[PDB]
Amino acid sequence: DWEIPDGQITVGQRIGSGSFGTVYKGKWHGDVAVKMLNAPTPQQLQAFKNEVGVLRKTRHVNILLFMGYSTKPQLAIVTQWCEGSSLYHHLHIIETKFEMIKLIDIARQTAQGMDYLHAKSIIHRDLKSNNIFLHEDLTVKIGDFGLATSILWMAPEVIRMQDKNPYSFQSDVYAFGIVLYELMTGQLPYSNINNRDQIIFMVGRGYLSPDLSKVRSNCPKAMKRLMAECLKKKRDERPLFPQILASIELLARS
Numbered sequence: 001d002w003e004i005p006d007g008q009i010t011v012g013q014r015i016g017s018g019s020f021g022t023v024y025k026g027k028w029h030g031d032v033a034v035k036m037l038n039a040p041t042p043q044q045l046q047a048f049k050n051e052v053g054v055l056r057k058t059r060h061v062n063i064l065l066f067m068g069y070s071t072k073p074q075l076a077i078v079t080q081w082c083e084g085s086s087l088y089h090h091l092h093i094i095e096t097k098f099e100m101i102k103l104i105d106i107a108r109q110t111a112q113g114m115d116y117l118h119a120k121s122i123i124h125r126d127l128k129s130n131n132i133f134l135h136e137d138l139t140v141k142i143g144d145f146g147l148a149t150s151i152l153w154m155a156p157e158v159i160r161m162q163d164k165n166p167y168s169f170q171s172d173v174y175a176f177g178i179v180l181y182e183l184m185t186g187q188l189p190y191s192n193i194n195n196r197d198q199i200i201f202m203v204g205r206g207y208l209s210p211d212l213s214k215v216r217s218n219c220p221k222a223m224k225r226l227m228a229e230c231l232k233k234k235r236d237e238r239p240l241f242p243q244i245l246a247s248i249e250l251l252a253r254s
């Protein structure tokens with residue numbers, strides 16, 4: 001079992017809070033991250049069993065490591081502690097300038113993790129650079145580091161919400177396409193539009209899409225074509241991760 005026996009965790013500094021939990025740094029055989037999700041309602045009890053259920057199906061280096069869960073006093077999920085910042089932070093907050101080979105490597109490791117989740121029939125549903133951690137500044141850890149459950153990474157069919165369920169291996173691929181655009185541009189899509197509602201309406205109709213012409217000239221053609229393919233408006237034109245990963249792997253070998 002992964003139940004952490006009671007009172008073994010030394011909860012330290014609070015890292016963040018939102019409507020759906022509070023996250024702390026803890027001590028449990030070393031540093032850990034602890035997310036505490038509250039007396040708990042049945043909506044909350046169910047979301048807890050779901051996240052635990054999904055986490056415990058994963059053992060891969062590019063996916064954040066689940067370590068256990070506590071049930072009392074509060075519902076809590078315990079994972080490894082990550083050191084450093086999200087890809088979002090590096091690209092758009094402290095604007096780190098990475099060597100092309102490092103951008104491509106970030107791309108590779110994210111594709112590795114996603115390929116993995118999908119091999120297990122796990123749809124992420126919220127992949128964004130903010131949920132890509134660069135641990136030790138070198139290793140990608142995909143998780144969900146947010147506390148609020150996000151439109152720039154949302155596939156057109158997700159926005160319309162007309163074919164519901166709209167989430168699919170392919171909506172994840174789209175999001176990943178938006179991550180590659182960030183990698184290869186240093187920027188978020190649609191930065192010259194300052195109106196959320198319109199981006200929403202325009203992406204969902206296919207009126208607006210990421211400006212691929214902004215892609216750095218030192219980016220390999222093959223990476224640019226991969227981006228355009230992932231970003232495809234009609235979901236089943238998008239490659240899946242086995243194909244996505246093989247491409248990044250192929251181009252890196254050059």
Ligand SMILES: CNc1ncc2cc(-c3cc(NC(=O)NCCC(C)(C)C)c(F)cc3C)c(C)nc2n1
Pocket residue numbers: 015023033034035051054055058063064077078079080081082083122123124142143144145146
């Ligand atoms: C800042 N460092 C750091 N390290 C580790 C961190 C770990 C988490 C975290 C994240 C999750 N959830 C989580 O990552 N869910 C998505 C998993 C999936 C990719 C398999 C679909 C959790 F259940 C518990 C915790 C503690 C969070 C929210 N933030 C973290 N922050």
